[PDB]
Amino acid sequence: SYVEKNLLSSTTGAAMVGLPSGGNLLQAQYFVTPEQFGAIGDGVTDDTQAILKTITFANTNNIQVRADKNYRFTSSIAMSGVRWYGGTFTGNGGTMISTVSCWMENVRFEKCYVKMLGGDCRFYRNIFSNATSTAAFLMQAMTSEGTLDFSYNEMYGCKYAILQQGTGEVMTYGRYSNNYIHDIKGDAIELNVVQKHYTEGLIIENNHIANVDASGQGANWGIGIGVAGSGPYGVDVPDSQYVRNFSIVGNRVYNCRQCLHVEMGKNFTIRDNEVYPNTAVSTGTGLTTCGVALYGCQDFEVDGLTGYLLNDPSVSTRMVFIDWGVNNGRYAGPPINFTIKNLDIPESSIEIATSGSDAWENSTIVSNINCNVFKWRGLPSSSTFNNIRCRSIDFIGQHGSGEGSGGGFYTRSQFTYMKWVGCTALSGDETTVSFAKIYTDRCDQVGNNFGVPTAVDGTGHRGPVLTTISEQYFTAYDEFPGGREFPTGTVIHCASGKKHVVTVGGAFFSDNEKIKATVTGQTYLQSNALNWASNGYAKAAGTKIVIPGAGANGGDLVTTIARATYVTNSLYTIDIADPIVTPTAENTQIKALNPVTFVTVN
Amino acid sequence: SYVEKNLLSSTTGAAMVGLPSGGNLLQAQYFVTPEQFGAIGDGVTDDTQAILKTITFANTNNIQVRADKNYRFTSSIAMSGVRWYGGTFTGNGGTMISTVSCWMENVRFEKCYVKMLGGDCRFYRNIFSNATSTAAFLMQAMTSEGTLDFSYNEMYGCKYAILQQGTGEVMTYGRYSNNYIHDIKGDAIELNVVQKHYTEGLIIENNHIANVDASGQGANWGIGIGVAGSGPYGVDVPDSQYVRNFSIVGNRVYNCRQCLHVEMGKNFTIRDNEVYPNTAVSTGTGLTTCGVALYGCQDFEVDGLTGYLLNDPSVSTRMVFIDWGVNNGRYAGPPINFTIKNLDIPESSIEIATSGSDAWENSTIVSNINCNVFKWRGLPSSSTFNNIRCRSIDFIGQHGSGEGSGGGFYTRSQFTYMKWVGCTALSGDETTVSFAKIYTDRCDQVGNNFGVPTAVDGTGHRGPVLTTISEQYFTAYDEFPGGREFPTGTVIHCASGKKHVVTVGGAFFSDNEKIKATVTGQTYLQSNALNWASNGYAKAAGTKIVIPGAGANGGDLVTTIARATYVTNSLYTIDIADPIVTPTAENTQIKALNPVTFVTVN
Amino acid sequence: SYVEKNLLSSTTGAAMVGLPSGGNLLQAQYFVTPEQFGAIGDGVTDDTQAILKTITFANTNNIQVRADKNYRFTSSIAMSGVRWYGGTFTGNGGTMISTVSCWMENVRFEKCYVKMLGGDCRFYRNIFSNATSTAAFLMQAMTSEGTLDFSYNEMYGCKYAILQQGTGEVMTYGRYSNNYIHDIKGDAIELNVVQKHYTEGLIIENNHIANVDASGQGANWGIGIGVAGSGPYGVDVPDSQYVRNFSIVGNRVYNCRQCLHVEMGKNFTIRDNEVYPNTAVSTGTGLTTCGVALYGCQDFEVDGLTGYLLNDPSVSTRMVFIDWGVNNGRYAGPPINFTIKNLDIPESSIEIATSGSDAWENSTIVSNINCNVFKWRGLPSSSTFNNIRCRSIDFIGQHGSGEGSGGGFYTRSQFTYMKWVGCTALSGDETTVSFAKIYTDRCDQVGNNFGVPTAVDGTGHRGPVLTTISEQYFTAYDEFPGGREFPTGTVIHCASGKKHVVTVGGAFFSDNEKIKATVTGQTYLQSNALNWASNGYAKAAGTKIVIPGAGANGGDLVTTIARATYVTNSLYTIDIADPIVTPTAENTQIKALNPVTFVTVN
Ligand SMILES: C[C@@H]1O[C@@H](O[C@H]2[C@@H](O)[C@H](O)[C@H](O[C@@H]3[C@@H](O)[C@H](O)O[C@H](CO)[C@H]3O)O[C@H]2C)[C@@H](O)[C@H](O[C@H]2O[C@H](CO)[C@H](O)[C@H](O[C@@H]3O[C@H](C(=O)O)[C@@H](O[C@H]4O[C@@H]5CO[C@@](C)(C(=O)O)O[C@@H]5[C@H](O)[C@H]4O)[C@H](O)[C@H]3O)[C@H]2O)[C@@H]1O
Ligand SMILES: C[C@@H]1O[C@@H](O[C@H]2[C@@H](O)[C@H](O)[C@H](O[C@@H]3[C@@H](O)[C@H](O)O[C@H](CO)[C@H]3O)O[C@H]2C)[C@@H](O)[C@H](O[C@H]2O[C@H](CO)[C@H](O)[C@H](O[C@@H]3O[C@H](C(=O)O)[C@@H](O[C@H]4O[C@@H]5CO[C@@](C)(C(=O)O)O[C@@H]5[C@H](O)[C@H]4O)[C@H](O)[C@H]3O)[C@H]2O)[C@@H]1O
Ligand SMILES: C[C@@H]1O[C@@H](O[C@H]2[C@@H](O)[C@H](O)[C@H](O[C@@H]3[C@@H](O)[C@H](O)O[C@H](CO)[C@H]3O)O[C@H]2C)[C@@H](O)[C@H](O[C@H]2O[C@H](CO)[C@H](O)[C@H](O[C@@H]3O[C@H](C(=O)O)[C@@H](O[C@H]4O[C@@H]5CO[C@@](C)(C(=O)O)O[C@@H]5[C@H](O)[C@H]4O)[C@H](O)[C@H]3O)[C@H]2O)[C@@H]1O
Ligand SMILES: [Mg+2]
Ligand SMILES: [Mg+2]
Ligand SMILES: [Mg+2]
């Protein structure tokens, strides 16, 4: 009347054991484990065949796998339809596990990698550690269309972490969110030639990436997050060559040679990312150091960016780099129809190369920027520049050969529009801007601390020649205000009713100016003739001046007034931004860099 | 000395089996399974009663349920306090499972739906598939106050996915985050008449929604994400009728007739959503196609929007639609106190209808916009418009009957303020704006490529009559600059000291202008008399001109200069934006659309 | 031939039971449970020793723990390397569980707290309820370097929820995301003196916090989210004293005395948070009520803020408070190099106290703001103010002793720059601004509804004395436009060619103005002499006026025209913003607050 030794060991033996529910143990087997198929789980014993039987059994009976041990395996394993919770797989270094419609949580993939081959796959709260394959999580040549949620995983110690190659069946939708990827030697997330994919959306969001160092590795290795469509680049190539409708939002990329990269992307947004590039990592892989690098892209925004470069600024300050593509050594595919905005990168610089044509429109917006150098090439059909705080401007509109990517390639004889509102180029006391070849038919400009010159490409080609009057002042006195630069066209209205019109932009310094002798290294000047605390002979900080003979080897010294008139040692004094190089003798003149001409009415 | 066959099958039988811990199997029963209560799990056998006993046992003993099979059930199941992990429920199509204070993970609800009835409920990493009930996840007539975290679930194949009806006990807090909802025939997330709910917050964030097609379904079906308070609409109805303090952030809604909808919302934010409306889906359900539709709302912002419409633009370009509500065929409840900003939707259009009164203030801000048509009705007590790039402006301030929602209903005789700074209305070569009925006491305007006319509603009612001078220019020459439009009040300062004041805004074209004969379809004009490459007879691109007799049936052709003066075939030439319709003979005049009048001082 | 009673109970007994896989029950033991070590799980029996053996066994054999019951424990438990799923721990109130490299999910920590001591720890989907210890989740004196993911947990009923004390080994990286913290009596998230920590990043994002009420508790208790570096404060103290490179993004903090707090932070961002402060909670703990409070911080942005205060506005409207630090009763450490932008807080106020020096630069940006009072102290080396909508401005540049934090401490004689573009100070009909001590060398200002006066700190010290002309108007008539305020320097161009230049800013009211008698409480005035519907004697709403003798005790009444000229009862009428206090007799004069002086040319 007792249970037999046999039968209890049979495939129905658990049916003999009662449980508090009133059912039996056989009814409690909601899973299988690899140990039930012979796995040792010691991380050393070869468990490959045990794993294969588990997968076969789970597929055939549609039963989830539970595991907690460490399964050493030595050759490829194919999985289809499996739900797997827990455990560690330990490959040879780069051994492959393929998944079709697989759901995996709390798994550690040690010294191996997962290759997704199709279906609806889901990966949560896993660890991918120490892979020596090209990628730790690979999407390539899928045999059926896929969707993917790849979220809250941690990946480290590998080469590429997440890599997609766009051959095969399409991924229609993918979310890559809240992963933690660190201490790797390839890209953290690279989606290569995926223009056909992600029709219903690609979203790469809230990933935290740290220490991407591809030193000594292959070409292009070491990008933080990268998305690539298909060449050839070109302003008019078909929409189907581009990766479209995707977003890269809220990620953090620390200590990486090139944090964010897109080429041949269209209709996309790069929003609120935080990046810390470093010239010193991924040595030899050929990447241009920066936070955001975009090539040949159209119809996109960069909206919100923070961080700074970790290397010394003398090596690089490049943070935003928006450029043409290249086909076989020839530039092609200017970026067009884009918005750069809300960047908070005061230490770091922006470089943009675009274009404009009669054959297609290009409308650009740059807005709400805090940066270091703002460097720009190209003349869109319309370009607006609003609330840019920068430390210098390096700007050429219709740039020619030798003046930047695609110089000379396109021109636009039709209506060309530009606007500059509320911008500030200022570093300490210096306002440092350079503008050229702005062949605009209309240019509105207000609220800037500088004037923007526009140019004419052949007589009559941009309408009547006009100068926008951006500054007008009132003085309670009649004498022209000295020592302060005014652009051409500036009007001064006097309380008496007189008015001055500036016909050659510049500043007034009397021909009777005399300064005290100077010595090398001196950063102030003192008056030996005129009253610099009068309005007519005043000295305004920010004004560019020339001190004859005071520069290197007796050249003229061009400098900036750093502090306006004050009295010390009973003399009128100003400070200059650059020290005297060659000493000057008593009663040397000082002059404006740009001497004003004005006319007076009444 | 051997175990009996009986007793081992008893409810304590597992106590006889030793484990490596040194305990017994009975101590390892941390869960129950449905199979322990007779469930077959084959998806075909009716397991309803087995499921009910499981729920009873789990509730009574506070023990979690584990499952992995497929439980066909055929009538309603009520659950309270249950923690359930895994398995598939398969109903008849719309069979109900109710939950009170339930926690569910990794469950598939197939052909059935969950109805939440109260407590603190949590749903993670579930699938809701193929429901034929009205909603797949329903909140209605809760019998106790609730909180809800509904996150990282996938829902598809249903009618409504998530639906709340606000009757019963309140949901005090709810987070709906990171769900994937697709291929449905009702709304993806609809919270209807929930003004009493969400005192401690409603947050709808980072959901990815795709393919919402309610064609052939009931009224209003097919909204992407919708939130509704209670009628009647009205500017002064009680705060308690509104859904308040909620947020809709970071969602993606692809291929949906009306992606985001709020009515009777107050103190809310719609931030950084990406939407792709489509006129072709939800045929017959009566929705206005767009990305964001807001009715009767107050104290809100739309901050950040991307995407575009999937249908052909000839059918619709409507993306943002902010409008009054309607009570029984009468408009009521103008939107007031709102901010529209940071929209990146260059292909798509914005339509806003508001109002202003002496009885209440309405302060509006529209800022940092990239859009197609900007259409506006209504005159707030203060309205600011900053850094708007658009392709046309269609604007009426105090709009009357027949000119938009609520036209004529309210007026404001007190101080009314408006500002336009740094805006651009431009499509290729055309600046296309229409303004009327701007009855402002002060209007500041700078940095725009157009002038904003203000109007007076009865003599003296807006102070002395002033025209803001928005443009002033300098010329090195005395002749008036030809061929370029200047608003009324424009001042031209000459290097000689002369000045021109524009007393009737417009452009100068000499009465002696003669052009060569033209033929139908021609898009250029050539001079037969004057030197168009002189400043006085210049031709600026963007200027609107009239070619007598060249329009349809010999009407005048109003067009725009597309390219300023150039020489070809030894003649001064300009391009026009619109082709000649009716041919013109040699020595026809060309004129400004708006002929200038100016006076010259000196 | 039957199984023995013994042996089946042995540590290998499960090996005798067959399963459908063909393996045995021993191979299915992927976990241990506390009941296998003697735990009763009734929440009452002391299970402390049972828990300790479980931890020992799990550590020694590297096996996960599963649990579902309620384990009462009574003294500290140390855990290292454990993977624990499920169950409830119930301490004495504040009993400690320590973790080193622990992974915990679906656990409830009742009346106890977790103290993290190092390694890589992970906490998901847990509940921390009713702790009476100082904190429910404590990081302090870690014995090895840590990383932490603390996400999707719920915490309530405690004192501090999450607290870190920065002594011991560093946390190199931490993500605190998507938690739900409510009904607590300390801070929700407080990271105190952690300047050495988070080299690879600190990210606090998408947490929902509600009801933080530290009434009756210790000093500083009741902050929503707080991050603190190390004193002493000071503009030039070493970088190592600051918490750096962190972010506080997307959180919601409802009903809290001080929602967000940072002191001694550098290179950080506070982005898109929603906050609802309340003066009534945390009574006695000494916190300044507001949404965001920053002390002594540098190189940071506040980007995006919504919400409002829950108390009556008469008690407080303070929402943003950016201030110096304090060392031993002396202010020190001005905030420098910061950007305040994208704030949508129309009901609530902003208070900023900064500084500027020759010894270091300070570049500030305030942009795209909707607020109530905008209060500012301090004169940076460069400061820009763009698209600020506010209800009043309270501004002093180089503020002195008694005029705000750090008044008098620093001055900058070198180039000092300021810009105001497109700002609006307006409350109903009143434009209420106060500016002083703006000692700038250049100040660009356009598109505002007010003028910004700049000042000179000693003759000659800011260059020639200039007034920016911010407004110019055109009139079709010659008479000066009456009843409307114009800043000094305003130019009016007449259609006749005449021009008026405003030499003393103000408004024109004729000396022949006479009004009808008034009575107390009256809010309109009526003309008894002049035609107020003429341009020369016009009355513009918004103009500040003086009614002699009409204020309290026969003082002059200074008020604002609320409605421009209209006719009622056959008399020219205006409305005023403030009622008559002391009655005035027939034929009293009305005057401008600021009487204009102008000169006319021609
Ligand atoms: C050096 C290089 O590194 C990676 O590529 C980088 C980068 O260097 C490259 O320049 C490119 O950079 C992008 C750039 O073009 C674009 O302009 O900008 C992007 C930024 O947005 C840049 O990222 O792409 C990067 C990813 C490697 O991907 C790359 O590999 C490729 O070249 C080598 C030749 O040197 C090989 O030819 C690779 O070929 C693949 O190799 C696998 C493999 O595992 O062997 C094949 O797979 C299969 O066959 C094996 C055989 O064994 C069995 C039978 C088994 O045991 O199971 O099956 C195995 C496996 O499961 C099978 O799938 C692939 O089919 C094959 O395509 C080629 O990918 C290079 O190393
Ligand atoms: C056509 C319509 O579709 C949905 O409503 C849509 C939309 O059409 C409608 O216009 C509205 O649109 C909103 C609009 O008003 C506002 O202005 O803008 C919003 C955008 O922000 C728009 O969304 O709301 C939308 C949701 C349906 O919700 C709607 O249903 C309603 O009308 C029909 C009549 O045609 C019914 O009267 C519905 O009544 C509910 O029906 C259920 C039910 O299951 O039968 C009731 O429940 C219970 O009783 C059954 C009986 O069986 C047992 C005993 C059992 O076996 O267990 O219990 C069952 C169940 O568990 C019980 O709860 C509800 O109580 C009852 O209210 C009504 O909802 C319509 O179909
Ligand atoms: C009142 C106060 O509340 C908290 O501190 C608040 C706040 O009041 C304080 O002003 C400060 O505020 C910050 C402010 O300075 C800065 O400027 O701005 C920040 C905003 O960004 C403000 O937050 O910090 C806040 C957190 C408490 O933290 C604080 O505690 C501290 O003071 C008291 C004295 O009144 C104690 O001295 C605390 O000392 C700690 O106490 C524990 C303990 O549990 O006893 C010690 O731990 C250990 O020893 C016990 C003994 O038992 C065993 C043997 C066992 O049974 O296992 O081990 C136990 C435990 O496991 C051991 O760790 C700590 O080592 C010790 O440091 C002191 O923290 C005060 O209550
Ligand atoms: Mg777009
Ligand atoms: Mg608000
Ligand atoms: Mg920074």
Discontinuities in chain C (C→N > 2.5 Å), after residue: none
Provide the experimental method for this PDB entry: X-ray
The residues that bridge with B103 in the sheet, in sequence order, are B83, B122
The residues that bridge with C331 in the sheet, in sequence order, are C326
Q: Report CA dihedral (B34, B37, B43, B46) to the nearest 10 degrees.
A: -140
Contacting residues for C91 by C-beta, under 8 A, at least 6 apart: C73, C74, C109, C110, C111, C112, C113
Q: Residue B458 CB: number of other CB atoms within 10 A? A: 13
DSSP structure string for A438-492? ---SEEEEES-SS------SSTTBTBS--EE---EEEESSSSPPPS--B-TT-EE
C125-163 per-residue burial string, b: 16 or more CB within 10 A, e: under 16: bbbbbbbbbbbbbbbbebeebbbbbbbbbbbbbbbbbbb
Q: Residue A570 CB: number of other CB atoms within 10 A? A: 7
| Residue C496 to residue A388: CA distance in whole angstroms | 40
Contacting residues for C521 by C-beta, under 8 A, at least 6 apart: C579, C580
Neighboring chain C residues of B473 at a CB cutoff of 8 Å: none
Compare CB distances from B1 to C4, C494, C535 and report the shortest one's residue: C4
CA-based angle B9:B11:B14, to the nearest 5?
Answer: 70
Compare CB distances from B35 to A16, A23, A422 and report the shortest one's residue: A23
DSSP structure string for C233-263? P-TTS-GGGSEES-EEES-EEEEESEEEEEE
| B537/A contact by beta carbon, under 8 A | no
CB burial of residue B329 (10 Å; 0-12, 13-18, 19+): exposed
| Residue A358 to residue A349: CA distance in whole angstroms | 30
C9 SS3 class: coil
CA C497 to mean position of chain CA atoms: 53
Atom of ligand 1 nearest to the CA of A163: 26
Instruction: Tell me the residue length of chain B.
Output: 602
CA of B511 to the centre of ligand 3 (A): 89
Q: Residue C169 CB: number of other CB atoms within 10 A? A: 16
Residue C192 near residue C239 (C-beta atoms within 8 A):
no
| Residue A288 to residue B294: CA distance in whole angstroms | 45
B129 SS3 class: strand
Q: Give the containing element (helix H, strand E) for B8.
A: helix B5-8
DSSP structure string for C444-492? EEES-SS------SSTTBTBS--EE---EEEESSSSPPPS--B-TT-EE
A102-130 per-residue burial string, b: 16 or more CB within 10 A, e: under 16: bbbbbbbbbbbbbbbbbbbbbbbbbbbbb
| Residue A168 to residue A181: CA distance in whole angstroms | 26
Residue B376 near residue B352 (C-beta atoms within 8 A):
yes
What is chain B's Cα-based Rg?
34
What is chain A's Cα-based Rg?
34
C195-213 per-residue burial string, b: 16 or more CB within 10 A, e: under 16: bbbbebbbbbbbbbbbbbb
Look up residue B34 and give its DSSP letter: G
| Residue C153 to residue C207: CA distance in whole angstroms | 10
Look up residue B415 and give its DSSP letter: -
| C125/B contact by beta carbon, under 8 A | yes
Structure tokens at A445: 């400009």
Instruction: Tell me the residue length of chain A.
Output: 602
DSSP structure string for A286-323? -PPPEEEEEES-EEEEEEEEEE--SS-TTT--EEEEEE
The residues that bridge with B302 in the sheet, in sequence order, are B270, B340
Question: To the nearest whole angstrom, how far is the Cα of B263 from the nearest Cα of chain C?
Answer: 20
Question: To the nearest whole angstrom, how far is the Cα of C292 from the nearest Cα of chain B?
Answer: 18
| Residue C470 to residue B469: CA distance in whole angstroms | 11
Q: Residue B61 CB: number of other CB atoms within 10 A? A: 12
Look up residue B24 and give its DSSP letter: B
What are the distances in angstroms from CA C602 to CA A394, B204, C95, C474, C599?
Answer: 46, 66, 90, 15, 10
C522 SS3 class: coil
Ligand 1: does its nearest atom lie under 6 Å from the Cβ of A248?
no
Question: To the nearest whole angstrom, how far is the Cα of B7 from the nearest Cα of chain A?
Answer: 8
- Which residues 369-388 in chain B show a CB within 8 A of chain C? 381-382, 384, 386-387
CA of C319 to the centre of ligand 3 (A): 29
CA C536 to mean position of chain CA atoms: 48
| Residue B178 to residue B151: CA distance in whole angstroms | 6
| Residue B106 to residue C105: CA distance in whole angstroms | 15
Look up residue A555 and give its DSSP letter: P
Atom of ligand 2 nearest to the CA of B217: 1
A257 SS3 class: coil
Structure tokens at B265: 């919302």
Residue B179 near residue B155 (C-beta atoms within 8 A):
yes
| Residue B237 to residue B264: CA distance in whole angstroms | 10
CA C256 to mean position of chain CA atoms: 12
Structure tokens at A266: 């269209």
- The gap between the terminal CA atoms of chain A, to the nearest Å, is 129
CB burial of residue A349 (10 Å; 0-12, 13-18, 19+): buried
| Residue A93 to residue A75: CA distance in whole angstroms | 11
| Residue A19 to residue A89: CA distance in whole angstroms | 33
AA letter at C108: R
Give which of B95, B98, B105, B143 is closest to B126, Cα–Cα: B105
Give which of A378, A248, A375, A371 is closest to A301, Cα–Cα: A248
C181 SS3 class: strand
For A192-223, the three-class secondary structure string (H helix, E strand, C coil) is ECCCCCCCCCEEEECCEEEEECCCCCCCCCCE
Positive or negative, the Cα torsion across C503, C505, C509, C512? negative
| Residue A486 to residue B331: CA distance in whole angstroms | 55
Q: Report CA dihedral (A112, A113, A118, A120) to the nearest 10 degrees.
A: 100
Between β-strands B77-80 and B64-66, what pairing exists: parallel, antiparallel or unpaired? unpaired
> Which single residue is written with the structure tokens 């009295």?
A567
What are the distances in angstroms from CA A384 to CA A302, A381, A416, B147, C369?
Answer: 15, 10, 11, 47, 21
> Which single residue is written with the structure tokens 């703006």?
C438
Show which subunits contact C, needing at least 3 CB pairs below 8 angstroms. A, B
CA of A134 to the centre of ligand 1 (A): 7
| Residue C452 to residue A476: CA distance in whole angstroms | 17
| Residue C91 to residue C83: CA distance in whole angstroms | 20
Q: B232 preceded by cis ω (within 30°)?
A: yes
Phi, psi at C386, each rounded to 5°: -135, 130
| Residue A503 to residue B259: CA distance in whole angstroms | 57
| Residue A114 to residue B185: CA distance in whole angstroms | 36
CA of B319 to the centre of ligand 4 (A): 12
CB burial of residue C521 (10 Å; 0-12, 13-18, 19+): exposed
CB burial of residue B12 (10 Å; 0-12, 13-18, 19+): middle
Structure tokens at C599: 């000169």
Give which of A267, A301, A202 is closest to B309, Cα–Cα: A267
What are the distances in angstroms from CA B404 to CA B322, B326, B336, B413?
Answer: 12, 13, 16, 20
What are the distances in angstroms from CA A102 to CA A55, A124, A597?
Answer: 11, 11, 78
Residue C434 near residue C394 (C-beta atoms within 8 A):
yes
Residue B124 near residue B137 (C-beta atoms within 8 A):
no
B83-112 per-residue burial string, b: 16 or more CB within 10 A, e: under 16: bbbbbbbbbeebbebbbbbbbbbbbbbbbb
Residue C38 near residue C57 (C-beta atoms within 8 A):
no
Residue B304 near residue B282 (C-beta atoms within 8 A):
no
AA letter at B278: N
CA of B202 to the centre of ligand 5 (A): 15
| Residue B511 to residue B591: CA distance in whole angstroms | 8
Give which of A125, A131, A133 is closest to A180, Cα–Cα: A125
What are the distances in angstroms from CA C41 to CA B370, B556, C36, C38, C79?
Answer: 62, 93, 11, 9, 19
AA letter at C42: D
Atom of ligand 2 nearest to the CA of B231: 17
| Residue C526 to residue C510: CA distance in whole angstroms | 15
B122 SS3 class: strand
Q: Do B474 and A469 touch (CB under 8 A)?
A: yes
Show which subunits contact A, needing at least 3 CB pairs below 8 angstroms. B, C
DSSP structure string for A358-407? SSS--EEEEEEEE-SEEEEE---SEEEEEEEEESEEEEESS--TTSSTTT
C16 SS3 class: helix
Residue B123 near residue B151 (C-beta atoms within 8 A):
yes
Neighboring chain C residues of A448 at a CB cutoff of 8 Å: 444
Q: Do A424 and C417 touch (CB under 8 A)?
A: yes
Query: What is the CB < 6 Å shell around ligand 3?
Result: C 76, 96, 134, 163, 190, 192, 218-221, 223, 226, 228, 261, 263
CA B250 to mean position of chain CA atoms: 13
CA-based angle C310:C316:C321, to the nearest 5?
Answer: 100
Question: To the nearest whole angstrom, how far is the Cα of B495 from the nearest Cα of chain A?
Answer: 6
Q: Do C19 and A29 touch (CB under 8 A)?
A: yes
DSSP structure string for A525-540? EEBSSS-TTSSTT---
| B14/C contact by beta carbon, under 8 A | no
| B184/A contact by beta carbon, under 8 A | no
For C545-596, the three-class secondary structure string (H helix, E strand, C coil) is EEECCCCHHHCCEEEEEEEEEEEECCEEEEEECCCCCCCCCCCECCEECCEC
CB burial of residue C401 (10 Å; 0-12, 13-18, 19+): exposed
Resolution (A): 1.8
| Residue C486 to residue B577: CA distance in whole angstroms | 42
| Residue B463 to residue B470: CA distance in whole angstroms | 20
| Residue B68 to residue B43: CA distance in whole angstroms | 12
> Which single residue is written with the structure tokens 């007796």?
A554
Contacting residues for B351 by C-beta, under 8 A, at least 6 apart: B318, B320, B321, B322, B323, B373, B375, B376
Between β-strands C247-249 and A180-184, what pairing exists: parallel, antiparallel or unpaired? unpaired
Q: Residue C247 CB: number of other CB atoms within 10 A? A: 19
Q: Residue B587 CB: number of other CB atoms within 10 A? A: 12
CA-based angle C132:C135:C139, to the nearest 5?
Answer: 150
| B598/C contact by beta carbon, under 8 A | no
